[PDB]
Design a protein around this ligand. Structure first.
Ligand SMILES: [K+]
Ligand SMILES: [Mg+2]
Ligand SMILES: [Mg+2]
Length: 50
RNA sequence: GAUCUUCGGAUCACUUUGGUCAAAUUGAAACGAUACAGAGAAGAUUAGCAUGGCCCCUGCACAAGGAUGACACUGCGACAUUGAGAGAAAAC
């Protein structure tokens, strides 16, 4: 019922592993797009408050 | 002017200007730095060769390099609808 605790750790890591997908370094491009969107939103908001 | 000629004249020669543009802030390029992230292949470290072109850089080069040079690598509707029921409406 409580099969110690390290197995919970490995189960959590396995669960994160099985559904991670999306490669490994594809996480850079989407983040860069999000940051560019944030910066352009800030620029536009600054223009409208001006 | 030189030559003859006979003091009438004839010979000899005959139209430049290489202009990225008028004495340098405002018409020959391409950027330093600081501040942000900050190094490809489904755990982790990592060899590379390619594909695409209004992306180039180094090179004498159709060698080869520049992170495998970099960017890109997805995704949807010439679907005909009927198959049926129900409440409505207009209709077997
Ligand atoms: K490499
Ligand atoms: Mg190469
Ligand atoms: Mg390449």
């Amino acid at each position: 019922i409580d099969m110690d605790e390290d197995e919970k750790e490995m189960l959590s890591e396995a669960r994160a592993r099985l559904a991670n997908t999306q490669g490994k370094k594809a996480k850079r491009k989407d983040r860069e797009k999000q940051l560019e969107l944030t910066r352009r939103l800030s620029h536009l908001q600054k223009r409208r408050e001006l």
